[PDB]
């Protein structure tokens, strides 16, 4: 599919998106970040660990260019930590990446990690930006409140962001973006004020890649089985009990605290589907669920016994929310080494059409165990 | 087109959208604000003549029957909203009732005016900032560390929606959707000549953020060009004149401050600029506004490259030392030398204006739809 590809996270993140990018990124010219910061940490395991963080992750084609977009926040040391940390496990990054000279910088005194405080610069128009390291007054209006040493590093990865897309897109090649966390986390939409400091949906690819909304081609929104969070704030379908636990464990639901975990939110997936768009889904994880006689799948919000429409800006509100549950009866037996759709357990199958049914869009990935191998293309 | 039309400036501002937007709001069922603040002052008028300033509030309110909405991406100064609302009305235009406003736009707060759009989008960043349904939230006392702002909570109470929902359900209906892109793309917080630009998304991206929609639901974009360039903030400036060309084109396009009274710095049309408005943007047509401006010129120069050290610059330079001293590549135009302020069809435009027409759609490749030649509200040609 000439054009942009897209892949979201569709919850609170760590939904596991990393193998289907990988998987994508093997019929991808170029791999992009278009917003956020070094906060959505992430590794993926092939024939060997590689650890990703603010580089896109679709690098692991060889064959790839990587791109960070006019949107993104850069921290100079972290991005060349990074980077030497790839190349010294034998992945060779610095022929194929390029970086916007428009990007913002996180500076030293942002972190007094500092994704807000750059983005909160930026706003202020104050903010410097990577083109800011190749001008000679970098260093006085620095002082208003080594980067040389990098700035020289630097130089070679930088090109001006509108034009490399523009050209990429007119000869044709196919694009894949790496959004970044996930919808409920966006800095709009998400559980304000428990929510990162910028775009994480789809709206953020548009803006971050300077590109036309008729140039994205495909959105494929990322589905966890169940539901994770990380930080405060309500959490309808949590449970603080054995299930709770289970998904935890057999999930190995931690960053090293562990995860909050709950049962799959489709109210949750309603509105972030409202939100990005999705052409197709990526349903993650869908063995952890492998040993659960019963799941309970979240299909409605009532407060005060009203249907409650959407998802609620007012996190108070949230918090009183009913929730009201489908219950479905699991497979009980290992889907970890399915390869296709039909090797799957009726109940999976059942599953994933309740999924589909219910948001009216289509499953197309599913994750069934950590491997990169362990995944089933249905269409 | 069910869906969303959207009307964004091409340039630095200023470049007279207004009558593109009510052109439009005349088929459009909601008008909606996406992004920006109270930062685009702008007028309507109707027949015996009466005018309507539209900041905040979708210009689109003109036509009768069209419901106006305030999108999540919008940071709002409340007492502002209710002073433009308020007069208005004063003059005999019905809003409240067709106004709608998303309870996650951000607040403008007086703190932030010590016209305070920059410091709202500073906190919203910091995630500190106040949202619309705040002033709900029986804590809205505690995190404001406020008697006039419970008072305007109640007036503003049967606006508020939620946006994701109330937008989804229009476009489900099949509602037509126009859109008011706030400034220009060349003000773009991202894209434009930083740091001298406005303090978010000025172009589509942030539409799509700012109503939280799809980008497959985006049907037209249209971008307004005004037929030279002019600017207002400090920075470079390739085209600008400061000789009698700048004179002129200030003079008789009447380019002063709103309500400063200032003088809007002036210069040639620079396509440069506008191919890469071009690209950010994705225009599927153009209005070329204030062409008559031009009507006095014998020659008329279009800025159509430019080179540093004698090699071509590709695109738009981020950095502002390298656009000032940008050498300018010109295309001189012969003048019209005749009043075009009366031509209502394309056909009746002297020969070298559609000259001056065709040579700006063939330099952008993207076909000129709408085009402005008087200060009057019936003063456009409809090309297609």
């Given at each position: 599919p000439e054009g942009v590809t897209v892949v979201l996270g569709?919850?609170?993140?760590?939904?596991?998106?990393g193998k289907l990018v990988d998987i994508l990124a093997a019929e991808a010219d170029i791999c992009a970040r278009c917003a956020g910061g070094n906060n959505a940490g992430h590794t993926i395991v092939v024939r060997t660990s590689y650890a990703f963080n603010l580089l896109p992750s679709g690098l692991i084609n060889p064959e790839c260019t990587a791109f960070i977009g006019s949107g993104v926040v850069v921290h100079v040391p972290s991005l060349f930590n990074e980077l030497d940390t790839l190349e010294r496990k034998g992945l060779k990054v610095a022929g194929r990446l390029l970086v916007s000279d428009r990007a913002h910088l996180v500076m030293g005194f942002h972190q007094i990690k500092g994704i807000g405080p750059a983005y909160s610069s930026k706003a202020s128009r104050s903010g410097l930006r990577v083109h800011h390291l190749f001008d000679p007054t970098f260093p006085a209006k620095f002082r208003k409140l080594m980067y040389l040493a990098f700035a020289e590093r630097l130089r070679p990865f930088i090109v001006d962001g509108p034009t490399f897309m523009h050209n990429a897109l007119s000869s044709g090649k196919r694009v894949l973006v790496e959004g970044a966390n996930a919808l409920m986390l966006d800095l709009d939409y998400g559980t304000y004020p428990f929510?990162?400091?910028?775009?994480?949906?789809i709206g953020g690819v548009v803006s971050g890649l300077?590109?036309?909304?008729?140039?994205?081609?495909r959105v494929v929104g990322v589905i966890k089985a169940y539901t994770t969070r990380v930080g405060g704030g309500p959490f309808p379908?949590?449970?603080?009990?054995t299930v709770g636990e289970t998904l935890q464990e057999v999930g190995a639901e931690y960053g090293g605290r562990r995860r909050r975990c709950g049962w799959l939110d489709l109210v949750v997936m309603k509105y972030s589907t409202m939100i990005n768009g999705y052409t197709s889904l990526n349903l993650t994880k869908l063995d952890v669920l492998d040993g659960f006689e019963e799941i309970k799948v979240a299909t409605g919000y009532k407060i005060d016994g009203v249907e409650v429409e959407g998802?609620?800006?007012?996190l108070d509100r949230l918090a009183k929310v009913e929730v009201q549950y489908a219950t479905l009866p699991g497979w009980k037996t290992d889907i970890s080494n399915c390869k296709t759709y039909e090797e799957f357990p009726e109940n999976a199958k059942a599953y994933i059409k309740f999924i589909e049914d219910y948001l009216g869009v289509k499953v197309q990935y599913v994750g069934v165990g950590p491997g990169r191998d362990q995944n089933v293309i249905i269409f």
């Open positions: 569709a919850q609170w993140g760590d939904e596991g998106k929510v990162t400091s910028s775009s994480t949906s300077g590109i036309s909304p008729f140039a994205i081609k379908t949590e449970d603080l009990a998802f609620p800006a007012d």
